[PDB]
Design a protein around this nucleic acid. Structure first.
Ligand SMILES: [Mg+2]
Ligand SMILES: [Zn+2]
Ligand SMILES: [Zn+2]
Ligand SMILES: [Zn+2]
Lengths: 66, 113, 263, 45, 137, 49
RNA sequence: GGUGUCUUGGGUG
């Protein structure tokens, strides 16, 4: 839905890295290199960001009803 | 709907003692201690501290159920020593070791700064 | 007799080798730093207007998971030990979040930096959401479109990680000992050869590998422990280590107190 | 009396148990009640 | 034997956490010419056979408002059925399911094909994994 | 219901007399029953639903 | 103080 604040397994804060990750993917860096640069070293933290599906973009498309 | 509160792990009620000592009559000069609202963190520390004293002959602990936050500890000592006294001795020794550890860590951290 | 040798020391993490201590002591320290070091986290949320797509308790869970500065949290009282019928200015920190999207294009992101500390037991240095830099935007909390609004009054309280993971000052405490398996505490599974098929520990060069002529030693116990504490910014690494030590000291003092005053 | 909202044109209004179920601004057929005024607390857990 | 240990901290951080929505429906029937049911908060004097739940949560229209916590056996849609030939009404109120808790999300109100009043009440709740929940790979 | 009360415990289908056995009660949190694992063979039970 | 009946389809053990 929206990026989780913490890593499930260990609890590192990954919620402040989604925008940097998107900008890194924009400038051509492949996913492993982007995750390396954000200093996500444990594969739990890495799969937190690598497997996220951002559905809030899809939910926001339905007009506010008030 | 049947989940107990997450603070009953550590918050001791007023009608529940923190510590309760009963003697083991089967072997001489032995006692059974039930620690309420504690877990492996204190138990393993105390057990491996007590296991290194010459006057402690038996020491062990168990956590009978993971869903209940207590452990029970069996401690035996030699004839002259009392297991209670060995327990205060172990507590004081670990306190001193932690204080020394803190002092050295602070000195190292200051030099590293 | 205990000794500490810091190998790396920055604000969020400290990597240190611990020596001349029992393994039980080191593991008790790891457990205490993971579970029993008090911090501050939002424990009560009050919704005024939430017209976002996210649900009220979804946002409440996310807000509860936001790290807050907890440097002075030890000078604070547990909300179960205060005489106040309701959290008073001294056992809680009150935060505000107000967000709103004006205009008919674009999306307004709601970040943790938008949280504003209103009250709290001043001048204690608690409560502020942790920023990485001066220009940090914090954690993503929600997103807002046209006329969608968020008006929230959060309460923050003192707690430990036993009660809920949001009070954990630490993420992952790496911990190992005996990189060369001299003590033979493990027994390596292999297909052809156990030395080729298993990667070396990152602290292998800190200890001499066993010689082929060497025989097994049955007196050696574990004596050197390599551990890397990491934080979430709520506490500093040295603060986490020192307060874990102090918490262990006070637990032991509690045991000593009960023993003496049960006589 | 009690606050409602339109389903088509998002208009807010209030009906008094005797008008039909309808919106004023457009005349749309489905309406939603408004969020309560009380204050709701969550545990953030 | 196909049991499985799960991390409590990961549960606390949101692992396998899910939202639940239950929607109740109700409308007014027409038993004749001027004999119909009505959405209205039923007063004890004019009504009989009232449910054992509480009615103190209904607005003046016999409907609860979104944002209100509801427990089991609580009434969320008040309705009265007239007594055929004061104290001339029977109740047809819809309680919440005796097992479920939650918070009202979206109370819809419209009219059916025949112009009679129509109500849908969606409840919301969150289910956090605990002992006995079923998982598979 | 309290600790050590004898209660009859049963899984369907009840193919033989050892599918319905008397147990002593122990009160516990959560909404799931607890069984020692050696008695799962006479019941033909497992813990996957 | 009193919360109704029968079939169809989809699952769990
Ligand atoms: Mg089965
Ligand atoms: Zn992680
Ligand atoms: Zn107070
Ligand atoms: Zn309208």
């Amino acid at each position: 839905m929206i990026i989780p604040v913490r890593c499930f397994s260990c609890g590192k804060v990954v919620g402040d890295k989604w925008d940097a990750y998107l900008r890194l993917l924009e400038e051509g860096k492949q996913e492993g290199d982007a995750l390396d640069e954000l200093k996500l070293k444990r594969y739990c933290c890495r799969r937190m960001v690598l497997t996220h599906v951002d559905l809030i973009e899809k939910f926001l498309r339905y007009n506010p009803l008030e | 709907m049947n989940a107990p509160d997450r603070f009953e792990l550590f918050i001791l009620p007023d009608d529940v003692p923190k510590l309760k000592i009963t003697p083991d009559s089967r072997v001489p000069n032995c006692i059974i201690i039930k620690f309420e609202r504690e877990d492996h963190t204190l138990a393993n520390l105390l057990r491996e501290e007590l296991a290194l004293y010459p006057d402690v002959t038996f020491v062990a602990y168990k956590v009978e159920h993971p869903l209940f936050a207590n452990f029970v500890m069996r401690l035996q000592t030699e004839e002259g020593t009392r297991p209670k006294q060995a327990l205060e001795r172990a507590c004081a020794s670990i306190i001193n070791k932690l204080k020394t550890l803190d002092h050295k860590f602070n000195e190292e951290w200051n030099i590293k700064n | 007799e205990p000794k500490v040798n810091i190998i790396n020391a920055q604000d969020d993490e400290v990597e240190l080798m611990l020596s001349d201590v029992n393994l039980s002591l080191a593991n008790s320290l790891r457990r205490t730093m993971l579970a029993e070091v008090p911090t501050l986290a939002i424990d009560l949320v009050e919704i005024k207007m939430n017209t976002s797509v996210l649900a009220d308790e979804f946002i409440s869970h996310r807000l509860g998971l936001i790290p807050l500065v907890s440097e002075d949290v030890e000078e604070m009282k547990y909300s179960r030990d205060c005489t106040c019928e309701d959290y008073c200015d001294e056992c809680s920190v009150v935060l505000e979040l107000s967000a709103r999207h004006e205009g008919e294009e674009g999306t307004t992101d709601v970040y943790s930096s938008s949280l504003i500390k209103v009250s709290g037991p001043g001048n204690l240095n608690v409560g502020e959401p942790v920023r990485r830099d001066d220009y940090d935007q914090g954690i993503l909390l929600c997103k807002l479109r046209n006329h969608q609004e968020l008006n929230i009054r959060c309460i923050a309280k003192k707690g430990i990680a036993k009660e809920h993971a949001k009070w954990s000052p630490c993420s992952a405490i790496a911990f190992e000992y005996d990189p060369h398996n001299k003590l033979k505490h493990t027994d390596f599974w292999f297909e052809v050869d156990a030395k080729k098929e298993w990667p070396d520990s990152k602290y292998a060069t800190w200890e001499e590998p066993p010689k082929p002529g060497e025989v097994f030693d049955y007196k050696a116990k574990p004596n050197r422990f390599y551990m890397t504490v990491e934080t979430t910014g709520s506490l500093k690494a040295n603060q986490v280590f020192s307060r874990g030590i102090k918490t262990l000291q006070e637990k032991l003092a509690n045991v000593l107190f009960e023993l003496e005053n049960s006589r | 009396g009690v606050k409602y909202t339109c389903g088509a044109c998002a208009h807010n209004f209030s009906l008094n148990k005797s008008d039909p179920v309808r919106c004023k601004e457009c005349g749309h057929r489905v309406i939603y009640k408004a969020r309560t005024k009380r204050m709701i607390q969550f545990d953030a857990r | 034997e196909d049991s499985m240990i799960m991390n409590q901290s990961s549960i606390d951080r949101g692992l396998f956490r899910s939202l639940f929505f239950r929607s109740y429906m109700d409308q007014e029937k027409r038993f004749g010419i001027s004999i119909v049911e009505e959405f209205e908060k039923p007063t004890r004097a004019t009504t009989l056979r009232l449910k054992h739940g509480t009615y103190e949560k209904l607005d003046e229209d016999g409907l609860i408002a979104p944002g209100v916590r509801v427990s089991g056996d609580d009434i969320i849609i008040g309705k009265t059925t007239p007594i055929p030939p004061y104290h001339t009404k029977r109740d047809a109120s819809t309680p919440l399911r005796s097992t479920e808790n939650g918070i009202v999300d979206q109370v819809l109100l419209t009219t059916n094909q025949e112009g009679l009043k129509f109500v849908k009440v969606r409840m919301r709740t969150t289910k956090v994994p605990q002992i006995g929940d079923k998982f598979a790979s | 219901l309290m600790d050590d009360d004898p209660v009859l415990f049963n899984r369907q289908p009840s193919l033989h007399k050892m599918s319905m056995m008397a147990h002593r009660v122990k009160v516990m949190p959560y909404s799931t029953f607890r069984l020692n694992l050696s008695v799962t063979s006479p019941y033909n039970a497992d813990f996957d639903g």
